[PDB]
């Protein structure tokens with residue numbers, strides 16, 4: 001789940 | 011809904 | 021007025037696997053009508069609305085009951101016929117996942133908080149008195165009865181469990197899981213009916229008929 | 232600790248029809264991640280569990296939000312894109328019945344009890360902190376956060392609405408309807424995806440992918 005991980009990290 | 015009506019009446 | 025002692029009295033008054041499960045459910049539908057009659061003010065509602073409430077709520081009401089009945093069972097449930105269904109049997113019938121949901125979201129949570137029969141009774145009365153049910157002639161009267169059950173439940177919880185202030189909320193927060201589990205069990209039931217290889221007796225069949 | 236002022240701040244920080252509805256939902260998914268970051272202690276959870284909670288709860292979280300946003304709308308909803316969907320339009324797209332459920336079980340009930348933004352915020356945080364979500368590494372920590380939100384909500388309600396002792400219960404008793412409505416909206420969404428004639432953008436599409 002690439003988008004969710006990306007937005008939560010940064 | 012015959013059974014339900016019957017059981018609720020009596 | 022909505023005394024928890026009357027609600028408790030109502031609970032205490034009524035005390036493959038798929039075929040067995042369907043048999044059990046049909047059998048409990050008869051017993052459910054008797055329970056509803058013993059809940060204060062239910063019988064005073066118009067007959068049409070008593071019908072609507074029981075058609076809308078029966079599945080959740082019966083799931084709540086067998087879940088609480090199964091607290092002493094290890095990795096399984098006790099049906100009203102006296103038969104047990106365990107994880108292995110449910111999995112082997114192709115219904116493993118929904119069965120696991122029941123155990124984890126209902127049976128174990130009830131076990132862990134030690135939900136008592138008064139609390140179960142009131143949760144069921146709250147489910148029974150559902151003002152969202154379609155076609156009710158007086159939703160406000162039903163909503164008023166629900167309000168009286170939860171005011172009574174809250175006072176009972178705070179008296180009996182004074183050092184668990186979150187207990188009342190915890191009970192009500194089992195209701196979304198019960199809603200979700202009820203919908204999925206009903207979905208399976210319609211499929212069993214579609215295939216036509218599972219006996220479905222008359223009261224259960226009646227509950228499946230279209231509004 | 233779980234201050235309602237921080238929860239409220241989180242809400243205030245983020246402030247055919249089917250195609251428009253899908254556009255709106257995708258757009259709000261980005262905004263939802265920002266909201267979750269502003270809820271106390273959420274960001275302190277493991278990243279994996281933050282992922283699980285948002286994947287499990289996003290639909291109910293977004294439905295809660297647009298429902299509350301639409302309280303001033305007559306027989307319709309206001310989407311995040313600024314577009315309105317009314318009953319007639321929803322019916323004409325073949326989704327009349329689920330649309331009516333939203334209006335009757337969510338929008339109108341929120342309107343009638345005048346649910347405020349703090350209460351909506353806390354309901355959403357309760358939904359966010361769902362300990363039943365599959366694969367959580369520490370369900371107990373999530374459950375502990377939920378417990379802190381509802382203890383905080385209850386105290387807020389009793390302070391701000393001292394003559395409505397049933398208010399707290401009434402808020403939580405919207406959660407089964409929200410669960411039910413969320414499941415049905417998701418069912419429609421999967422069908423829109425199956426047919427393949429409705430644009431579904433990347434974040435919404437990601438939410439639809441299989442675990």
Ligand SMILES: CCOc1cc2c(cc1-c1cc(/C=C/C(=O)O)ccc1O)C(C)(C)CCC2(C)C
Nearest residue numbers: 042044045048082083086099100115119205208
């Ligand atoms: C009447 C069938 O409804 C079901 C179905 C299931 C299941 C349970 C019920 C069900 C049983 C009852 C039996 C109650 C009782 O014995 O007291 C009542 C309502 C119900 O929805 C479990 C959770 C056991 C396993 C999955 C399936 C889908 C097979």
Ligand SMILES: CCOc1cc2c(cc1-c1cc(/C=C/C(=O)O)ccc1O)C(C)(C)CCC2(C)C
Nearest residue numbers: 253255256259293294297310311326330416419
């Ligand atoms: C992304 C599609 O999810 C839906 C579907 C619907 C509907 C709403 C949503 C939906 C919309 C949003 C939009 C939120 C916003 O604009 O803030 C978020 C999650 C959702 O499930 C309504 C209730 C408007 C009408 C019925 C259908 C099934 C078409």
